């Protein structure tokens, strides 16, 4: 009765497919964002320097 079961499972009564999904490879990256440099400016304005 054991052989008859093994005899019941065929190649054309139990095919055996393989299937995987396409997985992207993991990757570890660094990104440092530093804003534009900020420069001190000193200006004086007097009535003469405008007129000059």
């Amino acid at each position: 009765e054991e052989a008859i079961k093994q005899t019941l499972r065929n190649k054309f009564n139990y095919n055996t497919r393989e299937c995987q999904t396409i997985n992207p490879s993991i990757r570890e990256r660094g990104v440092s964002t530093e804003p534009p440099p900020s420069d001190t400016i000193c200006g004086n304005i007097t009535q003469w320097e405008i007129f000059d």
Binding site: D39, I41, C42, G43, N44, I45, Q47, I50, F51
Partner: protein
């Protein structure tokens, strides 16, 4: 005649719609935009007598909407300042007579 005839009180009276640039750290194209807005802006709310608050209410709001959120603009007869600013964010142009306009983006 010419320069010799011209006195300060004649020069100021002769011409009000003149324009003169001192410093210009900001890029060439962005100046052309701002210069037109501040000149048209001040003359509008110059009113009977020049409200210096009123001028810089208009210029502040205009330059917030036009470019960036934290834009600071001050005008005056005469003053001294040192002001930390970002690169290519600053124009200093004075209007004719006794009007000094500093505009920058912090």
């Amino acid at each position: 005649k010419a320069v010799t005839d011209m006195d300060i009180n004649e020069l100021r009276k002769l011409m009000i719609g003149k324009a003169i640039i001192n410093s210009s750290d900001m890029q060439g194209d962005l100046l052309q935009e701002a210069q037109d807005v501040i000149q048209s802006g001040i003359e509008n709310n110059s009113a009977p007598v020049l409200n210096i608050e009123a001028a810089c209410k208009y210029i502040k709001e205009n330059l917030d909407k036009k470019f960036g959120p934290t834009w600071q603009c001050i005008i005056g007869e005469g003053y001294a300042y040192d002001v930390t600013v970002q690169n290519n964010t600053l124009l200093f142009m004075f209007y004719n007579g006794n009007l000094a306009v500093l505009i920058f983006k912090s």
